Amino acid sequence: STGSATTTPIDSLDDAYITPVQIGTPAQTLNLDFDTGSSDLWVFSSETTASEVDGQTIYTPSKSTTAKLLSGATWSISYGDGSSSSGDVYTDTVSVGGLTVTGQAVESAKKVSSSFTEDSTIDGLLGLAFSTLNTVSPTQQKTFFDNAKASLDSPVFTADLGYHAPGTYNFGFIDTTAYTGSITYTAVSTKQGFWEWTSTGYAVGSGTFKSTSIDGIADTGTTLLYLPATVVSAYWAQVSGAKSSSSVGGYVFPCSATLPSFTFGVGSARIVIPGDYIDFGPISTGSSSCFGGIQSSAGIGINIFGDVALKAAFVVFNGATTPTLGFASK
Numbered sequence: 001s002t003g004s005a006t007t008t009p010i011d012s013l014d015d016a017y018i019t020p021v022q023i024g025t026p027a028q029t030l031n032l033d034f035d036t037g038s039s040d041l042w043v044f045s046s047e048t049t050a051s052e053v054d055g056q057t058i059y060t061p062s063k064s065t066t067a068k069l070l071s072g073a074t075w076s077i078s079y080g081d082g083s084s085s086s087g088d089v090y091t092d093t094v095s096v097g098g099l100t101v102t103g104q105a106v107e108s109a110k111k112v113s114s115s116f117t118e119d120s121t122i123d124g125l126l127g128l129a130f131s132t133l134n135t136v137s138p139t140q141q142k143t144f145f146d147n148a149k150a151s152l153d154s155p156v157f158t159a160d161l162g163y164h165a166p167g168t169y170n171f172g173f174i175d176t177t178a179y180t181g182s183i184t185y186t187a188v189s190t191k192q193g194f195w196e197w198t199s200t201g202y203a204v205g206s207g208t209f210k211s212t213s214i215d216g217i218a219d220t221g222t223t224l225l226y227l228p229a230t231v232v233s234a235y236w237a238q239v240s241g242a243k244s245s246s247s248v249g250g251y252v253f254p255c256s257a258t259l260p261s262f263t264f265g266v267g268s269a270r271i272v273i274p275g276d277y278i279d280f281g282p283i284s285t286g287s288s289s290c291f292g293g294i295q296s297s298a299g300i301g302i303n304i305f306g307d308v309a310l311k312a313a314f315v316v317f318n319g320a321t322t323p324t325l326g327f328a329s330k
């Protein structure tokens with residue numbers, strides 16, 4: 001089997017991407033944030049505290065004839081930005097882009113933190129990291145991909161995120177028309193439960209490529225590109241007037257600037273992020289200071305190849321017995 005679904009930016013800045021997912025019988029379609037950095041499929045629901053729902057579409061398990069409460073199971077997740085959610089667990093039928101999994105754990109939120117409530121465009125998350133990170137207790141549950149894998153034509157999924165445009169998540173096949181050149185594959189460590197890999201270096205604009213190992217994760221659920229302070233300083237030094245702002249929480253730059261590209265290495269291959277992909281717009285409405293899309297990972301404890309990086313590539317998440325990651329230009 002295979003599946004293919006369009007993923008759409010939630011706003012004009014590509015702050016996140018949503019993909020429609022069918023849950024239950026009859027189907028309830030929710031727009032979920034596919035997140036290769038986490039491993040829970042959780043949704044706003046009829047059980048979510050009413051004051052914490054503000055415009056999201058909810059899953060109502062009592063209206064699904066295939067939903068079954070998973071007895072005694074709860075979940076609770078705390079993301080690296082301080083946001084969180086928790087609740088109970090149903091199993092139900094879940095379909096993405098024509099690919100159907102029966103018995104998928106659907107984590108129904110009883111509580112969500114304020115930043116989820118405040119984003120009416122995201123109805124939940126669909127985790128695509130390794131199932132070792134799933135938070136369901138006392139019996140950990142499998143991700144949608146792990147449940148689908150054996151049925152797929154090939155045990156893979158691909159992320160093709162658009163810049164200011166729709167894109168695609170495919171399951172079970174590689175669309176050879178969706179990229180240019182070749183796909184370069186690179187080793188993955190699953191030791192932290194992530195799609196963790198080592199980039200071979202970077203360049204800023206037309207500058208010389210610096211060969212240096214940068215360990216990080218391929219994370220579709222993180223908006224920005226978080227890299228070591230030395231690398232980020234070298235990038236923003238090429239933008240006149242850019243500065244790290246403690247009050248804002250990162251590098252900012254004059255909105256009138258033209259940003260240089262940023263290149264990262266995948267083996268001997270190179271992925272070029274155009275400068276425009278690094279502009280996240282005014283820091284507050286009407287400001288002429290703009291937020292940068294490349295930020296320091298210092299004190300995160302890991303480097304994160306988030307959407308800013310991934311949307312410059314066609315990305316293969318190869319879930320074979322020994323997982324690997326593939327990157328192609330597009």
Ligand SMILES: O=S(=O)(c1cncc2ccccc12)N1CCCNCC1
Binds near residue numbers: 033035116122222223
């Ligand atoms: O998806 S999130 O970007 C995230 C968290 N809270 C609220 C949000 C509101 C809108 C869009 C995204 C949000 N996220 C959770 C997984 C990735 N880790 C980083 C933080």
